Design an enzyme around this catalytic site. Structure first.
Site: not given
Ligand SMILES: Nc1nc2c(ncn2[C@@H]2O[C@H](COP(=O)(O)OP(=O)(O)O)[C@@H](O)[C@H]2O)c(=O)[nH]1
Length: 327
Positions: A43, A45-46, A49, A51, A66, A154
């Site tokens: 579906l 790509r970000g 992740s 999807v 995902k 988000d």
């Molecule tokens: N589980 C998961 N983690 C995600 C996703 N998108 C982003 N992240 C993680 O979220 C982090 C950013 O969150 P944050 O609260 O700022 O963490 P910090 O970098 O430890 O301060 C990124 O470094 C990714 O590892 C997602 O879709 N799923």
């Protein structure tokens, strides 16, 4: 140093909970069988992740898979804990299983099926009634997660899935979602550029649930004015200038004065001087049928620099703008 800030609602929800609720690092994942799901099509790509549309081959029911990129794999437990804590909540995506992807060797989250249609596909097409109806459905989700001590961080059109035919909506992608702890400093590198609150853009780390209310306000402004996106910055610095051209520079300086924030000096050569604009400036022949005194009053109460002065999700749901919505 910056003045501290606390959420005016659901301030101490996590402090009263047993550690098990918010201490996601201590959570033990009950891994499912990756074999149960057959991938059908990618579906999207970000940066964090991939999807996929998939089929749970045992019951023939469609699912969404995902698969986390290696960069996001480290925060698997945070997203799982949040999704399980919110499961059954109004308009929140339902986590069905957690499996280990054999190819990426990263975790894969399995969700119950929702229409492939993002809100971005439909939100510039809606009637005045449907904008109100769908905005109320989103508010249901936000008030629920906020009441459960969670910030989404988000909120954007791509994170809302719609089944317009069946008048159904789901708030998705809880990957940046975090537990609200009063006094905690958070990462400002969250949300997408166009939906970033001024707290993020001025680097104020002690933010809360109100971050989601700004993002919602940006979505509403884009829908009622048919302007995609409403605040169209070229980068994070220009994003603040775009907001300042609408909300004015005087209220921005008042906001930074209140929290004793020191604005990046690069803003001295681009911010300039701007008066607050009246919302009728954005009204024209193409969007006038979507604009009402109630809509503008509601928008005015979401799009405020001061994160503490913004309507909360519950207060937003009480707004006269939602009186015409069948409840
Ligand atoms: N589980 C998961 N983690 C995600 C996703 N998108 C982003 N992240 C993680 O979220 C982090 C950013 O969150 P944050 O609260 O700022 O963490 P910090 O970098 O430890 O301060 C990124 O470094 C990714 O590892 C997602 O879709 N799923």
């Amino acid at each position: 140093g910056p003045v501290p800030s606390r959420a005016r609602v659901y301030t101490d929800v996590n402090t009263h909970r047993p550690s098990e609720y918010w201490d996601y690092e201590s959570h033990v994942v009950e891994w499912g069988n990756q074999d149960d799901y057959q991938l059908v099509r990618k579906l999207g790509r970000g940066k964090y992740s991939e999807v996929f549309e998939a089929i749970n081959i045992t019951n023939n029911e469609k699912v969404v898979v995902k698969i986390l990129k290696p960069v996001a794999a480290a925060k698997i437990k945070r997203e799982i804990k949040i999704l399980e804590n919110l499961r059954g909540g109004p308009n929140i995506i339902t986590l069905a299983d957690i499996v280990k992807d054999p190819v990426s060797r990263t975790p894969a989250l399995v969700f119950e099926h929702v229409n492939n249609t993002d809100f971005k596909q439909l939100y510039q097409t809606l009637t005045d009634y449907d904008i109100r109806f769908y905005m109320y459905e989103i508010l249901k989700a936000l008030d629920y997660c906020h009441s459960m001590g969670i910030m989404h961080r988000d909120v954007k059109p791509h994170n809302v899935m719609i089944d317009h035919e069946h008048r159904k909506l789901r708030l998705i992608d809880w990957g940046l979602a975090e537990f609200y702890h009063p006094g905690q400093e958070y990462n400002v590198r969250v949300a997408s550029r166009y939906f970033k609150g001024p707290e993020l853009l001025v680097d104020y780390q002690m933010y809360d649930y109100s971050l989601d209310m700004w993002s919602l306000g940006c979505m509403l402004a884009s829908m009622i004015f048919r302007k995609e996106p409403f605040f169209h910055g070229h980068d994070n610095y220009d994003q603040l200038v775009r907001i300042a051209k609408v909300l004015g520079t005087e209220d921005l300086y008042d906001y930074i004065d209140k929290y004793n924030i020191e604005l990046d000096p690069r803003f001295n050569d681009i911010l300039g001087r701007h008066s607050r604009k009246r919302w009728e400036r954005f009204v024209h022949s193409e969007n006038q049928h979507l604009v009402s005194p109630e809509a503008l009053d509601f928008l005015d109460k979401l799009l405020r620099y001061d994160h503490q002065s913004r309507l909360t999700a519950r207060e937003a749901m009480e707004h006269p703008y939602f009186y015409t919505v069948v409840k």
